[PDB]
Amino acid sequence: PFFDVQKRLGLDLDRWMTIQSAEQPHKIPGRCHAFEKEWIECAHGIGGIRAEKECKIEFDDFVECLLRQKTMKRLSAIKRQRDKLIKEGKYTPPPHHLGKEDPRP
Amino acid sequence: AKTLLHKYSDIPEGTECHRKAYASTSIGGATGLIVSAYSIALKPPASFLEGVARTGRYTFTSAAIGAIFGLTSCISAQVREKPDDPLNYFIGGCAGGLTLGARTRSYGIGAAACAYMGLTAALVKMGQLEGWQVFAEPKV
Amino acid sequence: TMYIAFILSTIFVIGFVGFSSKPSPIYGGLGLIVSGGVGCGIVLNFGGSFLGLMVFLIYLGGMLVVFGYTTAMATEMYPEVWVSNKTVFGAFVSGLMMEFCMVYYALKEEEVEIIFKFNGLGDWVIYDTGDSGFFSEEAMGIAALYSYGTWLVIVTGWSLLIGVVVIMEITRG
Amino acid sequence: MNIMLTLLTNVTLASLLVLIAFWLPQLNAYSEKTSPYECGFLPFSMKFFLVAITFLLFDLEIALLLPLPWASQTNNLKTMLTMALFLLILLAASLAYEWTQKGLEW
Amino acid sequence: MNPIIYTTLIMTVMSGTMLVMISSHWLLIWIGFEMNLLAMIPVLMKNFNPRATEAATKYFLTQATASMMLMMAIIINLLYSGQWTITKMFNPVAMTMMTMALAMKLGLSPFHFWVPEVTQGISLQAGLLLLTWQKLAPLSVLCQISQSINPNLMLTMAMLSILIGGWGGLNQTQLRKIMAYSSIAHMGWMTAVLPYNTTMTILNLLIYITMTLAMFMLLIHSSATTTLSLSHTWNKMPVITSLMMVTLLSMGGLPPLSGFMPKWMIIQEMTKNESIIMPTLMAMTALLNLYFYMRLAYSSSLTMFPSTNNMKMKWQFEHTKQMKLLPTMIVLSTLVLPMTPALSSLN
Amino acid sequence: MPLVYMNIIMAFAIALAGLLMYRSHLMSSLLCLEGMMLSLFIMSTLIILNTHFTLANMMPIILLVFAACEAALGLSLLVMVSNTYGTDYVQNLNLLQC
Amino acid sequence: KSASSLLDLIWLETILPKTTSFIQMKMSIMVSNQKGLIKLYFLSFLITIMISMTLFN
Amino acid sequence: YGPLAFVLGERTTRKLTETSKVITVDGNICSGKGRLAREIAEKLGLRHFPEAGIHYADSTTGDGKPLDVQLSGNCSLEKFYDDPKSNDGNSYRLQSWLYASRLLQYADALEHLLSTGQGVVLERSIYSDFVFLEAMYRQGFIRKQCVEHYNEVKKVTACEYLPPHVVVYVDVPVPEIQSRIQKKGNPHEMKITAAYLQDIENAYKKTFLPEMSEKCEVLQYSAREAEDAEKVVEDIEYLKCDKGPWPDQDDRTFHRLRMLVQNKLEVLNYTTIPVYLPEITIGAHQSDRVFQKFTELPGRKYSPGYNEDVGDKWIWLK
Amino acid sequence: TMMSGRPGRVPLQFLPNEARSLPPPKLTDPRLVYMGFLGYCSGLIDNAIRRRPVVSAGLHRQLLYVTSFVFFGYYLLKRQDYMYALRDHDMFAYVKSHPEDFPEKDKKTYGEILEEFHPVR
Amino acid sequence: GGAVMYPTKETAHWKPPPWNDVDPPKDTLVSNLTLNFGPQHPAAHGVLRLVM
């Protein structure tokens, strides 16, 4: 029994904090503002049943932005291979990656 | 969980009776462990040895019932050469009930358990064949 | 010091085991003060200065101090440590062992999965590269409560006032 | 690292002083006071706890009042002012309830 | 308790439930639940008794654990979805945890244990509030998340609730405990169709509310808490106990009383979803509820227990209090079966 | 999820286990309940900060306030029970059965 | 004997009504343990949480 | 009066004054306590309550005319005086009925005090009815189980009320009591045993007077002293009001008590505790027959104002 | 949720304007008559509980019971009819919009079809 | 009448709940403290013992 008195009376009581793509103070953007915006715009009025399948790509990318699980997996794989190569002496981290070369401003 | 039921079902009826009984025994033992945990929590055992004894008793009873059911059903299907008869499951269920009575050392408990367990096992076989859904997925 | 946050999180778990072993209230209260202080450290490490000081000032400063107040006035217990009678000692040790097993399965095996998927990479990775300028995101958002969250303010205030009323009605005998 | 260093140094200094005050001074031999702690055997008055629960609730309301300095920078000054005054009025109302009714007995 | 303070506390409980049923943000729903608990404890302990204090403590402990688990599930859903709206939960583990918490708030078995104890400890008015109004908010939250609700878990909890409610009711003699176990069984019936059709749950909830209101008000009017104390009522006011008999028969669900409507519609919806074993077992187990209802009806009005000499003095005086809703509630809870096609209004 | 999130969730689980498995003092159970609130505070804070959910930085504070309110309630109930019985032992709460 | 007592008044009643009622009575006794201890049913709650998390994943 | 009136502002403490006091005059059988109680009420302006009788409830309701004993009370004091060890349980049934009547009387009195503000003088009370039951048990008139049930009924009912501010005891020796009873002339009174009177006196002086002394002042008076009403009134006036729990009460508690005493059925709710003692237990058939007879009585069929048989009209619009 | 989430459903609206296109429930509708019967029964029960003449006390009270029941029942029936009309309308529209999912089976006479005869012996 | 409809051996001894929801006061141990005004206390001037 979601008595949506908010929409009936046109009063926002908690919809401001429902999503991170909503207006935040001083226009401070959310970390995954773009992805959430895309997902919401895709799944607007098409129904939850259709949204679950049709807008799957948007939500998948949004979750990847939120948790960075696949990105972390890729970075961990790179780190593991790099460390393996270091143990065998088949790789030498470049001086700029070693910090020898000064960074750009 | 569902993997144990998968183990039991994957073994074709009237085949691999030892393996079928093993899977049924594992299922029964798991159920016994669950019952033992609930009994220990609700009815506190005075000593840790008492808790171990209660757990062992419940687990052994349930596992023995499951083993007897599985072996009886598979062997009945093998001998009859009819793996799609609910009678196989019924015979296994009644045998399991008799084993329960022996474990409880009560003939009346055994007889009633045989009747009810055999009926339920036959019903389970009938559902397996027809397609009866205990927890239907919301379809409307 | 790249894994400082992980060390703090492990100490947080250890303190949670310590007070969750249900020891003598006085020793438990400490098991909670220590864990609370660690958690504040973690929040500070992520940049939540205001929220970090929030738990230190309110949870640790007031909530747990009133908890200790009660334990002190209604003192009917025989003092014992976390490594006292086996009921508490065994629980503490077993909790620590479970945590250590999780840690080993988390570091040695990168993709540890018990009920959720966990990655063994240092938490520093999850940090986002961004600039807030002359801003305190945490402070600005929390201060927006008075501007954006008027409804939250109303409900929370009514809850507080009715809480005072309820406390008196309960503790009137 | 600086604040962590300060905390470490302060804690270690205090603990070292506690060492040199709890174990070092008791090394000096002072005979033995063969004096038993003669004990031969509860004021759980609400007068104390009440002071504690009320403090907890007022401290909670104070927590809600902490973000006020940054909240003064909002463009919606009227709304922020109204909400702040509302929270303060509720604090005063809670105090008044306890004072008017059987409270503040301390 | 001062009447003004009591009215404020009752309104606070109602406002918590309304916030739960009005909010679109998970945090606000949790806030509403917390307000309900805070304003419910004093109402439970309006009449200071050691049993009342024990009931309040147990209720607080259970509801606090439920709220903790609910907020944890909300936080996990936020972590895996970055969403606060009360919609399809996007994490299965959070869904399971939230289901456990909401079931504990409702009292569905195996989280039923606290319900009879708390109901027995608190007064008849507090029992009425606990078993009718406190059931609204968790059911509303469940209805909103019904799509994400795991059918298997919910069905298991509901069926166990029905079984355990019937069994417990069979052994009880205290009227409040009988009512509590019957409430557990009825909540099982309500939540069984939650994954299938929420409107049927609303229907069952409304009928249950009317029936429990009528029963509790009749108990208050008769001022009886045990089977014998209710048995004495026939000597003073036969009308009350006869109407109690009618309401008990409705609670059993025997046609053509109102109680048949929810069971009938629930079985209809479950059969539409190709589930036949589950509703059959549900009705066959509700027979036990009917059994203890019939035992109570026997002792109350169908048969006449011995009375006491002091009853003569009570005969002279008449009840001053008048519960205005009681007649309408009795009528709506007994004779409404000819009005099932009004189900559409709920939609 | 990062290992820190795993540790905090595990802390919540441990505190829940301690709360559900009472020993003697009801005070110890209340401590476990409040610990869980602390763990939820830390979890929500980290999530909000990482997501830069600026408008939702007020959620942990509200959680904290309501947490301490429900605690004030628990303590008040504990002292009522202790004053009646003499101790805060969970076993004392036995008058109500089933 | 055989019809009136042995079957009608003894076995027929033992087979269906008596048995079912006795089972219900024993189940009622088990459910209404009448212990009323927070420790026990809260431990049962913990067991339930674990079992649900494993079975329904 | 209800919760709304208390919300509106009706406070009992505003009406209550120093005069507002519950004064109970107690004593042994035929101690002349009634005369002294009347004198106290007249010289203090308080409202005197005659000692609760078997048909006290009959006076409060209906037309005040005592109903049939079979329909109201089912017990005889005269039978108890003639046969104190009857097999019909008349002794304990009478004692329990008297306790219920006195419980109603105390509530009726409190309601008067909390509504009008005028003090009340009562001849004995619930706190004093135990004396007769104890005497009966000592004499062997009633069995122990009857005493147990009476204690059960008292502990669940009397606690809800407030003990009297002043307990006046008219101490008349048992021989003088016997002399007065002989002069009284009542044959049933003449049948009263001396041991019963001695047990009553012993119960008073050893249980009632000390316990009441703990709660409040106990102005014990000799028969000669009781004759001087002026002195008795003066002593009561000079009693510290601190004696009694009334100084510890407030408008909220007084509101609770006033709501309690108004609902007479609530007052007598626990008088019918479902304990099946043969003395008090009435069979279902007899219960039904007697209740049907009671309902047939004019003015009892319908609620007051709706009994047209008594002259009520406009019922169609009532 | 069925039609709880229908597009264009104004929240907390008992009777939308589109319901007016549907025929109003007759004031002599048997369902409304049963509602009035329930109201009268409520009045009788109220009289019985308050120990006043069941069939004569408070004629105004019983009248108000009946009037309230009928009055609320009229709108209840109107809403019920509206919801059932919504059901039928949506079902027909869905069938029209999805012809492939609702085919027209070939209509064959009984002379053409073959039904096995099961003799009853 | 009784605690439960079908009582067991253990439950047989168990007493039905009290008529009023008021459980009897248990022990009623006094919390009045008996403090002693030790002489060393300044106010006692070293030579005063006030059992209070």
UniProtKB/Swiss-Prot annotation, chain C:
Chain segments annotated as coiled-coil in the UniProt record: none
GO molecular function, one term: NADH dehydrogenase (ubiquinone) activity
Annotated compartments: Mitochondrion inner membrane
EC number: 7.1.1.2
Transmembrane intervals: 1-20, 24-44, 46-66, 87-107, 148-168
UniProt xrefs under Pfam families: Oxidored_q3 (PF00499)
Keywords (A to Z) from UniProt: Electron transport, Membrane, Mitochondrion, Mitochondrion inner membrane, NAD, Respiratory chain, Translocase, Transmembrane, Transmembrane helix, Transport, Ubiquinone
GO cellular component: mitochondrial inner membrane; mitochondrion; respiratory chain complex I
Catalytic activity: a ubiquinone + NADH + 5 H(+)(in) = a ubiquinol + NAD(+) + 4 H(+)(out)
InterPro entries: ComplexI_Subunit6, NADH_UbQ/plastoQ_OxRdtase_su6, Nuo/plastoQ_OxRdtase_6_NuoJ
Described purpose of this protein according to its UniProt entry: Core subunit of the mitochondrial membrane respiratory chain NADH dehydrogenase (Complex I) which catalyzes electron transfer from NADH through the respiratory chain, using ubiquinone as an electron acceptor. Essential for the catalytic activity and assembly of complex I.
Family: Belongs to the complex I subunit 6 family.
Record's protein name: NADH-ubiquinone oxidoreductase chain 6
Organism the protein comes from: Sus scrofa (Pig)
Lineage, highest ranks first: Eukaryota, Metazoa, Chordata, Craniata, Vertebrata
Gene designation: MT-ND6
UniProtKB/Swiss-Prot annotation, chain D:
Single GO cellular component term: mitochondrial inner membrane
Reactions catalysed according to its record: a ubiquinone + NADH + 5 H(+)(in) = a ubiquinol + NAD(+) + 4 H(+)(out)
Bilayer topology: Multi-pass membrane protein
Molecular function terms from GO: NADH dehydrogenase (ubiquinone) activity
Localization per Swiss-Prot or TrEMBL: Mitochondrion inner membrane
Keywords linked to the UniProt accession: Electron transport, Membrane, Mitochondrion, Mitochondrion inner membrane, NAD, Respiratory chain, Translocase, Transmembrane, Transmembrane helix, Transport, Ubiquinone
Class of enzymatic activity (EC top level): translocase
PANTHER family: NADH-UBIQUINONE OXIDOREDUCTASE CHAIN 3
Record-stated family: Belongs to the complex I subunit 3 family.
Quaternary structure, from the entry: Core subunit of respiratory chain NADH dehydrogenase (Complex I) which is composed of 45 different subunits. Interacts with TMEM186. Interacts with TMEM242.
Protein name: NADH-ubiquinone oxidoreductase chain 3
UniProtKB/Swiss-Prot annotation, chain E:
Pfam short name (any one): Proton_antipo_M
EC number(s) recorded for this UniProt protein: 7.1.1.2
Annotated catalysed reactions: a ubiquinone + NADH + 5 H(+)(in) = a ubiquinol + NAD(+) + 4 H(+)(out)
Keywords: Electron transport, Membrane, Mitochondrion, Mitochondrion inner membrane, NAD, Respiratory chain, Translocase, Transmembrane, Transmembrane helix, Transport, Ubiquinone
Transmembrane feature ranges: 3-23, 25-45, 59-79, 89-109, 149-169, 178-198, 200-220, 237-257, 274-294, 325-345
GO molecular function terms attached to this record: NADH dehydrogenase (ubiquinone) activity
A GO cellular-component term linked to this record: respiratory chain complex I
Annotated InterPro entries: Complex_I_Subunit_2, NADH_DH_su2_C, NADH_UbQ_OxRdtase_chain2, ND/Mrp_TM
Bilayer topology annotation: Multi-pass membrane protein
Subcellular locations according to the entry: Mitochondrion inner membrane
Enzyme category, top tier: translocase
GO annotation (BP), single: mitochondrial respiratory chain complex I assembly
Family: Belongs to the complex I subunit 2 family.
Functional description taken from the UniProt entry: Core subunit of the mitochondrial membrane respiratory chain NADH dehydrogenase (Complex I) which catalyzes electron transfer from NADH through the respiratory chain, using ubiquinone as an electron acceptor. Essential for the catalytic activity and assembly of complex I.
Assembly and interaction partners: Core subunit of respiratory chain NADH dehydrogenase (Complex I) which is composed of 45 different subunits. Interacts with TMEM242.
Name of protein: NADH-ubiquinone oxidoreductase chain 2
Organism: Sus scrofa
Gene expressing this chain: MT-ND2
UniProtKB/Swiss-Prot annotation, chain G:
Shown segment, full-protein numbering: 547 to 603 of 606
Chain's role: Core subunit of the mitochondrial membrane respiratory chain NADH dehydrogenase (Complex I) which catalyzes electron transfer from NADH through the respiratory chain, using ubiquinone as an electron acceptor. Essential for the catalytic activity and assembly of complex I.
TM annotation in the entry: 36-56
Family, similarity comment: Belongs to the complex I subunit 5 family.
Organism lineage string: Eukaryota, Metazoa, Chordata, Craniata, Vertebrata
Coiled-coil features, chain-numbered ranges: none
Quaternary state and interactors: Core subunit of respiratory chain NADH dehydrogenase (Complex I) which is composed of 45 different subunits.
Location in or out of the cell: Mitochondrion inner membrane
This protein's name: NADH-ubiquinone oxidoreductase chain 5
